[PDB]
Amino acid sequence: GTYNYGEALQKSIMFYEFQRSGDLPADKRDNWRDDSGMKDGSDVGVDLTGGWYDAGDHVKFNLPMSYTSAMLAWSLYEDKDAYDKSGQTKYIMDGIKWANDYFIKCNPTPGVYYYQVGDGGKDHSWWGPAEVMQMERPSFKVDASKPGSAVCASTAASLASAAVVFKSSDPTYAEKCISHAKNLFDMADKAKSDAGYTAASGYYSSSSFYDDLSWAAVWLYLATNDSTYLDKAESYVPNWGKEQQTDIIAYKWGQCWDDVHYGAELLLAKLTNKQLYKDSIEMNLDFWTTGVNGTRVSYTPKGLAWLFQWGSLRHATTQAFLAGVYAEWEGCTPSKVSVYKDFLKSQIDYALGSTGRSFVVGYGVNPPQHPHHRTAHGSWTDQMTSPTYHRHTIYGALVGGPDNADGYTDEINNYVNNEIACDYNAGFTGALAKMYKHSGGDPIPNFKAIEKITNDEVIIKAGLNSTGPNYTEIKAVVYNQTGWPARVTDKISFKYFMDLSEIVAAGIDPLSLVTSSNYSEGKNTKVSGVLPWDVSNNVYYVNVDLTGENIYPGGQSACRREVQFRIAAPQGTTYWNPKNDFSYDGLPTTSTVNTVTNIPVYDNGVKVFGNEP
Amino acid sequence: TYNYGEALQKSIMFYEFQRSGDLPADKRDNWRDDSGMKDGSDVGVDLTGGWYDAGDHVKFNLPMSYTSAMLAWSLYEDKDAYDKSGQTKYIMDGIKWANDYFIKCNPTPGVYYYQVGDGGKDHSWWGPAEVMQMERPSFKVDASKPGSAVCASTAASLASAAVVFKSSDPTYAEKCISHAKNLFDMADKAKSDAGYTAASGYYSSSSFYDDLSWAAVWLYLATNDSTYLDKAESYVPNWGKEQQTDIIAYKWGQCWDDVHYGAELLLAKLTNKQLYKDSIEMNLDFWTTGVNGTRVSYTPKGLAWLFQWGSLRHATTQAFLAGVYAEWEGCTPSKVSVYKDFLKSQIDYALGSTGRSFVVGYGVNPPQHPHHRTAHGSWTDQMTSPTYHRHTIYGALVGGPDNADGYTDEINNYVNNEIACDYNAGFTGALAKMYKHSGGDPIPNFKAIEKITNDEVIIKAGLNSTGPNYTEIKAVVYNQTGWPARVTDKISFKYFMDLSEIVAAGIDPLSLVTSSNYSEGKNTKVSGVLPWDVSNNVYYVNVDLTGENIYPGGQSACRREVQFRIAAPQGTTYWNPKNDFSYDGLPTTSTVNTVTNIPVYDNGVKVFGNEP
Numbered sequence A: 001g002t003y004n005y006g007e008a009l010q011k012s013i014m015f016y017e018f019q020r021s022g023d024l025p026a027d028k029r030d031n032w033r034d035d036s037g038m039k040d041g042s043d044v045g046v047d048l049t050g051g052w053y054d055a056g057d058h059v060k061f062n063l064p065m066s067y068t069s070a071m072l073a074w075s076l077y078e079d080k081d082a083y084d085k086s087g088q089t090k091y092i093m094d095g096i097k098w099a100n101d102y103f104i105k106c107n108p109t110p111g112v113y114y115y116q117v118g119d120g121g122k123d124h125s126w127w128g129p130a131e132v133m134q135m136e137r138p139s140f141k142v143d144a145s146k147p148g149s150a151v152c153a154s155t156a157a158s159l160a161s162a163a164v165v166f167k168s169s170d171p172t173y174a175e176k177c178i179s180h181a182k183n184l185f186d187m188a189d190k191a192k193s194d195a196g197y198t199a200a201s202g203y204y205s206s207s208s209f210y211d212d213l214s215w216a217a218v219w220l221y222l223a224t225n226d227s228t229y230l231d232k233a234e235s236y237v238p239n240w241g242k243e244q245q246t247d248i249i250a251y252k253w254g255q256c257w258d259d260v261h262y263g264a265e266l267l268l269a270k271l272t273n274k275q276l277y278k279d280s281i282e283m284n285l286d287f288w289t290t291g292v293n294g295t296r297v298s299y300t301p302k303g304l305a306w307l308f309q310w311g312s313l314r315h316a317t318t319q320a321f322l323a324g325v326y327a328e329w330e331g332c333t334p335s336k337v338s339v340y341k342d343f344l345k346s347q348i349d350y351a352l353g354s355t356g357r358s359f360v361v362g363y364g365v366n367p368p369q370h371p372h373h374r375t376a377h378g379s380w381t382d383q384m385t386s387p388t389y390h391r392h393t394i395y396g397a398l399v400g401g402p403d404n405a406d407g408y409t410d411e412i413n414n415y416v417n418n419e420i421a422c423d424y425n426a427g428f429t430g431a432l433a434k435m436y437k438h439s440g441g442d443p444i445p446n447f448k449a450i451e452k453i454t455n456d457e458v459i460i461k462a463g464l465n466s467t468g469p470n471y472t473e474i475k476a477v478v479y480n481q482t483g484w485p486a487r488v489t490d491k492i493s494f495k496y497f498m499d500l501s502e503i504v505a506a507g508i509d510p511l512s513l514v515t516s517s518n519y520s521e522g523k524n525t526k527v528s529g530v531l532p533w534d535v536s537n538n539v540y541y542v543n544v545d546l547t548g549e550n551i552y553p554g555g556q557s558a559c560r561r562e563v564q565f566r567i568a569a570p571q572g573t574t575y576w577n578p579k580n581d582f583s584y585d586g587l588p589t590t591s592t593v594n595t596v597t598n599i600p601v602y603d604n605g606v607k608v609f610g611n612e613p
Numbered sequence B: 001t002y003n004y005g006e007a008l009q010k011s012i013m014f015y016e017f018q019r020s021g022d023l024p025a026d027k028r029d030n031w032r033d034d035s036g037m038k039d040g041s042d043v044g045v046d047l048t049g050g051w052y053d054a055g056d057h058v059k060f061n062l063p064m065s066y067t068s069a070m071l072a073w074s075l076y077e078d079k080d081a082y083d084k085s086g087q088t089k090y091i092m093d094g095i096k097w098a099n100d101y102f103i104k105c106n107p108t109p110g111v112y113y114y115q116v117g118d119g120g121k122d123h124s125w126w127g128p129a130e131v132m133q134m135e136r137p138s139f140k141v142d143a144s145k146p147g148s149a150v151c152a153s154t155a156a157s158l159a160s161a162a163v164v165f166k167s168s169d170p171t172y173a174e175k176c177i178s179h180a181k182n183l184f185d186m187a188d189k190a191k192s193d194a195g196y197t198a199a200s201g202y203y204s205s206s207s208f209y210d211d212l213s214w215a216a217v218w219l220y221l222a223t224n225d226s227t228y229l230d231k232a233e234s235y236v237p238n239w240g241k242e243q244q245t246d247i248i249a250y251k252w253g254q255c256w257d258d259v260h261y262g263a264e265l266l267l268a269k270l271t272n273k274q275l276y277k278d279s280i281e282m283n284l285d286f287w288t289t290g291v292n293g294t295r296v297s298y299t300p301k302g303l304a305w306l307f308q309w310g311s312l313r314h315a316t317t318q319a320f321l322a323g324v325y326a327e328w329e330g331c332t333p334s335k336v337s338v339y340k341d342f343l344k345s346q347i348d349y350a351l352g353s354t355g356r357s358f359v360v361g362y363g364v365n366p367p368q369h370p371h372h373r374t375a376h377g378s379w380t381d382q383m384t385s386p387t388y389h390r391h392t393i394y395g396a397l398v399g400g401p402d403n404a405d406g407y408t409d410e411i412n413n414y415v416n417n418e419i420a421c422d423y424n425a426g427f428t429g430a431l432a433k434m435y436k437h438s439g440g441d442p443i444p445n446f447k448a449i450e451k452i453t454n455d456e457v458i459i460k461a462g463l464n465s466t467g468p469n470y471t472e473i474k475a476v477v478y479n480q481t482g483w484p485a486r487v488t489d490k491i492s493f494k495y496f497m498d499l500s501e502i503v504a505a506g507i508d509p510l511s512l513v514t515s516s517n518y519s520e521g522k523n524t525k526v527s528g529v530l531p532w533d534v535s536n537n538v539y540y541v542n543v544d545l546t547g548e549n550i551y552p553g554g555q556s557a558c559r560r561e562v563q564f565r566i567a568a569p570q571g572t573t574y575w576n577p578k579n580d581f582s583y584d585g586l587p588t589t590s591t592v593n594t595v596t597n598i599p600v601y602d603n604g605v606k607v608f609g610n611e612p
């Protein structure tokens, strides 16, 4: 049971690059993600482009998004040596900056914070790649009158933690992050309410904000060194959730997007050395390991600390991270250090392959093949079932995980065991960095996700629609099956080649033949008259132009354009011979079209599919 | 402000968890059992019983008798509090538990066993009382080797017990008196602690005239024979004085080593002489308002702090004496409220006035790591494992904070976090008085039947070595018993296989060869292949550990490793471990892990794992 923690780490970081929204950098290392959500914020007149899509959807939910970047920054703060040695420092910093540059955009003026872009209902009702989304993507904000303490504080924490890890390499950016972190924190602190945080209801409803206030205050303290914030962080503790039948700080759950008091108390213990926080975090970690006060988290037969049905791996690997960080602190109860470090490894190893298979996409043995993800799947027909395989490998994604009995099924709509999301990989990345520091495992040098194109991106299918002594009528259908990256193809055209030697010999002008279209989709489709290709050899063709048609891989009608065209010799004549026409050879009889390779398709004049005579 | 009745109830219960010997069937806990069952066997005397002193298992009669004497004093002073709280039965059972033991320790006139167990050997092992393996020698005093303090302290315990048992059990009261008289005679004739040596380093005595007066006072109350009152008073000029003065010491407090405080309090009530009234009030004043420019230290949060060791023990004991004296008609009127305020303030500090309780299993945020072997319940002779106490020793008052209220709840801090008999003695009496004054209902029908929080007996296994014709298993059984901790000498386990392939090969499953390369216990017996459910071709290998002295008291002690193999004829290739029930999930390495398909039995009863 040996696992390459370095490779797992580099892939977990790369996962977020695949989640990026906005104007993607020229230096990206994949060939399947491209610009998307480019009009984000346009509905309110604010540039809100950037950030990460939440899960297998394209909504930008700022609570889990900010929780994610705050956790990544925490990891970099605790283990920079791991990121430097593994050569991954540059990549995680770029990811941290990607999320935070967007949060800065979301705080355009003091007192205003945009916390979501996209409508859950509108976004989830379409199954296709991010690059060609066609639906409205509304922007939502909170302010003094419509407060969002949890999301504002979670974002302040992300910005503040970003400042901590960026201060050394670029103080100006760190300074800017702190400025926005302070405003968002003040908004959250004064309001003490999530009343205005409504667009995320049912997706990321907030069940607490005092935890976020402490978490944000702790990070502002670390970024500014102003104890004002440390006092504030401690002041919220009495208001944190407690254990039902006692008056003790809650300890039977774990660090997650909705509950960050575990991370806050862990850091408060390290920063103040106060018994209360040491007792609290150890009660939580003990519950996750050896058990405490006659209570322990459930464990699957195969060794996974199982909190509950949704994202079991997410919870276990996040706790593994906290256990690892706390175990290295001098204040940790000496007798628990080994228990905590063993827990860190056991849970991470479960995710990586201890049961005989990996739960990380594109990593290890038998990794998940069908994670619930729209863009990685790459349907061009708005169907979760087509194609029957994922066209892209979204490296590093940690799936939800098995049930309490280690039961797991790899299906695209097992939206409970196979979901993937930013928050699922956040603590995981931190735990991996800690294990790499402990046990190594070499990352793949200069790793990239430049995929081989596995299906022809723009094709054409054709068949004989009608025939007569003086004519041939073809039914052709062009299909946009683009995926590298998925894209609108509005400059497509195709050519139908004929040998008109028989027309010339009959004493008829080959360029005089009547071309026509019985039917076609698209206001712009244009069928040319007969044009010369290689006159010396009597080869001519008909050009069918679809330029202007916004064909995109987002539905049956969307991805295609059918065009029926005919070429006719004079009425009443019988010398027309389609049998010596290049494009007629092997042409499917009947109108039941089949893919053909002798009716070449061009993209902006460049042949991309099929052959010429 | 606090529930004094519940506190009182649990403080009494504390002693039940300290009990050594053959425990009663009416026991209200499921984690303590018979222990120290051979106590006295080295001298041919049944010396079983009594209370273990602190977080250890030595029976130190000086603090033990001080404790029971103080508990009886409380019952004598406040029977009405015990009756109303419905705890009378429980404190009387405790008082009798200690005194029945002291009686056993006085087997013949002039002979007194004052200790069972050796501090050095007892403290060198960290585990539950029920499975102690070390020798526990008995020690005695007699005319040639005297122990005046321990003999008189025991006489006081027995005589005070007689006073409170006289009404309900006059015969036992007489029994206690008979023995009290003999031990006091021993102490009075000898006037020396020269032979009291086995407790050196733990409870060495620094005075015995105080014990002589304390015993004489109780013998007088028990017998009404003026002879004893005269003796009690005759020892006063021999009590320790305050340095450079002829003043009876007043700057310390009532405790196992110095009982002149309790003796003078009682002598004041019994004789009304000014000498005694002045002396006890000088002590109480020193502890409250201060006196002659001197006063005990107080912590910022209100704790009268006497000494680093057991600060709570001293403060709550003085609280008890203050309460008793304050109620007496002879107490200076103006000091009555002062003394009663002190009683409440010191008790409230112990119960939770600083924001947390210093009483195990009581109030808000009580101590979780008291220095106590059996409550912790380690099965590996490790103070550090497990990292939490497997049992809740209700009522135990911890040592207490430093002079700045600093307190660290950790198992290894035996100075501020140990618990002991004497720590709860005066405490119990002060609690009875607070209950009488402010109430607080005890918990109805309270018992300490805990849920089993860890599998008491488990087995871990792994694949030792394999082959095309065999499977070799390495398994380790572990005794992690705690309810109660116990020797598991009737343990066995079964390894199940499906031998359909053997039958199909024309071979007799019962002919396969079983063997063992390594075995930890000398009684380990690995059977040949046996039938279990032949209808489904299920056979098994039975591994019997019966006879093994497996106990929760050490890394090697609690476990037994067994490596066994089952093999088909050499050269054959039909052996298939995959359809074997016990092979499923088996760690494919010599590194073992907890498994649930190799069931463990205790006297034939399956206690861990599943069968096919």
Ligand SMILES: OC[C@H]1O[C@@H](O[C@H]2[C@H](O)[C@@H](O)[C@H](S[C@H]3[C@H](O)[C@@H](O)[C@H](O[C@H]4[C@H](O)[C@@H](O)[C@H](S)O[C@@H]4CO)O[C@@H]3CO)O[C@@H]2CO)[C@H](O)[C@@H](O)[C@@H]1S
Pocket: A055, A056, A057, A202, A203, A204, A205, A207, A241, A250, A252, A253, A256, A258, A259, A310, A311, A419, A420, A421
């Ligand atoms: O009281 C117990 C603890 O509850 C914690 O709160 C829980 C809450 O009780 C529970 O219902 C949700 S389930 C939640 C899941 O955690 C998210 O990861 C998941 O995300 C969805 C997203 O909503 C979808 O839009 C996309 S398509 O898929 C992702 C897949 O993950 O949504 C689920 C439903 O909202 O989790 C809460 C957090 O753990 C409290 O935080 C804790 O304090 C207490 S003790």
Ligand SMILES: OC[C@H]1O[C@@H](O[C@H]2[C@H](O)[C@@H](O)[C@H](S[C@H]3[C@H](O)[C@@H](O)[C@H](O[C@H]4[C@H](O)[C@@H](O)[C@H](S)O[C@@H]4CO)O[C@@H]3CO)O[C@@H]2CO)[C@H](O)[C@@H](O)[C@@H]1S
Pocket: B054, B055, B056, B201, B202, B203, B206, B207, B240, B249, B251, B252, B255, B257, B258, B309, B310, B414, B418, B419, B420
């Ligand atoms: O000089 C001032 C007064 O001294 C009194 O005598 C003191 C003595 O000087 C002092 O050393 C001890 S400290 C002692 C403590 O009292 C015990 O309760 C404690 O018990 C230990 C036990 O020894 C261990 O075997 C077990 S595992 O743990 C328990 C934990 O409590 O041991 C401590 C060290 O031996 O206290 C004496 C009594 O107060 C005189 O009695 C007094 O007259 C004078 S004025």
Ligand SMILES: [Ca+2]
Pocket: A150, A206, A207, A208, A209, A210, A211, A212, A257, A258, A259, A260
């Ligand atoms: Ca929260």
Ligand SMILES: [Ca+2]
Pocket: A498, A499, A500, A501, A502, A576, A577, A578, A579, A580, A581
């Ligand atoms: Ca032709």
Ligand SMILES: [Ca+2]
Pocket: B149, B205, B206, B207, B208, B209, B210, B211, B256, B257, B258, B259
């Ligand atoms: Ca003495």
Ligand SMILES: [Ca+2]
Pocket: B497, B498, B499, B500, B501, B575, B576, B577, B578, B579, B580
């Ligand atoms: Ca078999």
Ligand SMILES: [Mg+2]
Pocket: A023, A024, A025
């Ligand atoms: Mg660009």
Ligand SMILES: [Mg+2]
Pocket: A077, A078, A079, A080, A081
């Ligand atoms: Mg570090």
Ligand SMILES: [Mg+2]
Pocket: B368, B369
């Ligand atoms: Mg603790």
Ligand SMILES: [Mg+2]
Pocket: B022, B023, B024
């Ligand atoms: Mg019995």
Ligand SMILES: [Mg+2]
Pocket: B498, B536, B579
């Ligand atoms: Mg079978």
Ligand code: NI
Pocket: A369, A370
């Ligand atoms: Ni598949």
